[PDB]
Design an enzyme around this catalytic site. Structure first.
Site, PDB file in Angstrom:
ATOM      1  N   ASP A  44      17.069  12.300 -38.964  1.00  0.00           N
ATOM      2  CA  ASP A  44      17.892  12.606 -37.830  1.00  0.00           C
ATOM      3  C   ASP A  44      18.211  14.268 -37.964  1.00  0.00           C
ATOM      4  O   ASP A  44      19.247  14.544 -38.356  1.00  0.00           O
ATOM      5  CB  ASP A  44      19.356  11.886 -38.026  1.00  0.00           C
ATOM      6  CG  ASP A  44      20.319  12.116 -36.490  1.00  0.00           C
ATOM      7  OD1 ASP A  44      19.555  12.690 -35.807  1.00  0.00           O
ATOM      8  OD2 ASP A  44      21.281  11.607 -36.537  1.00  0.00           O
ATOM      9  N   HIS A  47      19.159  12.824 -32.847  1.00  0.00           N
ATOM     10  CA  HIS A  47      19.971  11.924 -31.713  1.00  0.00           C
ATOM     11  C   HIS A  47      20.600  12.685 -30.645  1.00  0.00           C
ATOM     12  O   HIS A  47      21.159  11.853 -29.661  1.00  0.00           O
ATOM     13  CB  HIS A  47      20.764  10.760 -32.650  1.00  0.00           C
ATOM     14  CG  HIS A  47      22.073  11.280 -32.966  1.00  0.00           C
ATOM     15  ND1 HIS A  47      22.357  11.573 -34.338  1.00  0.00           N
ATOM     16  CD2 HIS A  47      23.168  11.430 -31.960  1.00  0.00           C
ATOM     17  CE1 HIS A  47      24.037  11.688 -34.047  1.00  0.00           C
ATOM     18  NE2 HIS A  47      24.163  11.797 -32.850  1.00  0.00           N
ATOM     19  N   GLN A  58      32.134  11.027 -33.618  1.00  0.00           N
ATOM     20  CA  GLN A  58      31.283  11.310 -32.439  1.00  0.00           C
ATOM     21  C   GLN A  58      31.534  12.602 -31.746  1.00  0.00           C
ATOM     22  O   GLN A  58      32.644  13.243 -31.712  1.00  0.00           O
ATOM     23  CB  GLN A  58      31.786  10.395 -31.278  1.00  0.00           C
ATOM     24  CG  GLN A  58      32.254   8.868 -32.078  1.00  0.00           C
ATOM     25  CD  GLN A  58      30.739   8.153 -32.298  1.00  0.00           C
ATOM     26  OE1 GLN A  58      30.934   7.267 -33.172  1.00  0.00           O
ATOM     27  NE2 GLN A  58      29.764   8.737 -31.885  1.00  0.00           N
ATOM     28  N   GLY A  59      30.491  13.351 -31.515  1.00  0.00           N
ATOM     29  CA  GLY A  59      30.499  14.568 -31.024  1.00  0.00           C
ATOM     30  C   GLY A  59      30.535  15.717 -32.133  1.00  0.00           C
ATOM     31  O   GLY A  59      30.413  16.871 -31.917  1.00  0.00           O
ATOM     32  N   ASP A  60      30.546  15.393 -33.466  1.00  0.00           N
ATOM     33  CA  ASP A  60      30.357  16.087 -34.509  1.00  0.00           C
ATOM     34  C   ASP A  60      28.822  16.350 -34.974  1.00  0.00           C
ATOM     35  O   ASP A  60      28.316  17.085 -35.613  1.00  0.00           O
ATOM     36  CB  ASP A  60      31.113  15.519 -35.850  1.00  0.00           C
ATOM     37  CG  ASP A  60      32.620  15.930 -35.381  1.00  0.00           C
ATOM     38  OD1 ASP A  60      33.106  17.102 -34.983  1.00  0.00           O
ATOM     39  OD2 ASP A  60      33.482  15.042 -36.046  1.00  0.00           O
ATOM     40  N   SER A  61      28.114  15.344 -34.423  1.00  0.00           N
ATOM     41  CA  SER A  61      26.529  15.325 -34.941  1.00  0.00           C
ATOM     42  C   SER A  61      25.812  16.709 -34.702  1.00  0.00           C
ATOM     43  O   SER A  61      25.980  17.500 -33.762  1.00  0.00           O
ATOM     44  CB  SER A  61      25.893  14.321 -33.931  1.00  0.00           C
ATOM     45  OG  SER A  61      26.368  12.946 -34.547  1.00  0.00           O
TER      46      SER A  61
END
Ligand SMILES: [Ca+2]
Lengths: 235, 59
Positions: free
Chosen positions: A89, A41, A182-185
């Protein structure tokens, strides 16, 4: 990462950050000199992406950083088979020029399906990244890491109306306060096996961050290890 | 067998004949002399911190 702590330079030498339309929009892990594994993603078909390994403080210069361009992006073939689910993912990024391995730039180990699953079942792993340190809050400048316990599937299942497939797993605390965000993906969920860290998950999604009754959802790497090895073969 | 404590194998364990055990390690490492532990066979083996962090010890 919410409720975590600053990593020390070189503590997670396989961690990388991804820059593009947005700076530091996701994390990723070094598979080998030419490949990074991350979350699908994070890399929509099209846009240009850059990878920075040996990164620690996003606003400073440590002279350990290695910047590379992404020439090929391989999202799992089943990602987005079903709309807006995040199943599968995971994605792979090929670098234009090999990274030079050193104390700050080191691959993460990847066991086989059987052992990755055993390592995950130990029930405790670390997650890291430069994502938000507060739900809807600011992003971190210094790499953050947090230890998170594995969550039983039935509890996982009941914490959300959304579907949790067998290609995912839950990790976090019943009381909240600590979670990836958020941002850690794309960043890794890793399990330490007697000093040697193994990739057990990929930071994928969740409902808000660090909320009591909610957990972080991770891509279960055990189901994708054969795919990773097959695509990242060095020649 | 691999049943208990991974058959004493530091990394991987596979069951062999007569309830025996055959250990193995991941790329970048090598099965030591005692066929149990795993040792670095390259400058920077995967999954290991080599910076030691900070600077204050005997070394
Ligand atoms: Ca820096």
């Amino acid at each position: 990462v919410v409720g975590g702590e600053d990593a020390k330079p070189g503590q997670f030498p396989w961690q990388v950050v991804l820059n593009g339309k947005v700076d530091a929009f996701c994390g990723g892990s070094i598979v080998n000199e030419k490949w990074i594994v991350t979350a699908a993603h994070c890399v929509e078909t099209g846009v240009k992406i850059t990878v920075v390994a040996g990164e620690h403080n996003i606003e400073e210069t440590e002279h350990t950083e290695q910047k590379r361009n992404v020439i090929r992006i391989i999202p799992h073939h089943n990602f987005n088979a079903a709309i807006n689910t995040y199943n599968h993912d995971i994605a792979l990024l090929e670098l234009d020029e090999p990274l030079v391995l050193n104390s700050y730039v080191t691959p993460i180990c990847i066991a086989d399906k059987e052992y990755t699953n055993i390592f995950l079942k130990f029930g405790s792993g670390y997650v890291s990244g430069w994502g938000r340190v507060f739900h809807k809050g600011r992003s971190a400048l210094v790499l953050q890491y947090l230890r998170v316990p594995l969550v039983d599937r039935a509890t996982c299942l009941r914490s959300t109306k959304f579907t949790i497939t067998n290609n995912m797993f839950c990790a976090g605390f019943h009381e909240g306060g600590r979670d990836s965000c958020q941002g850690d993906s794309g960043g890794p969920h890793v399990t330490e096996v007697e000093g040697t860290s193994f990739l057990t998950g990929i930071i994928s999604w969740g409902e808000e961050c660090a909320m009591k009754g909610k957990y972080g959802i991770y891509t279960k790497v055990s189901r994708y290890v054969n795919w990773i090895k097959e695509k990242t073969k060095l020649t | 067998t691999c049943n208990i404590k991974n058959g004493r194998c530091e990394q991987f364990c596979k069951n062999s004949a007569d309830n025996k055990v055959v250990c193995s390690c991941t790329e970048g490492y090598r099965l030591a002399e005692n066929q149990k532990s795993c040792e670095p066979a390259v400058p920077f083996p995967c999954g290991r911190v080599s910076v030691s962090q900070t600077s204050k010890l005997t070394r």
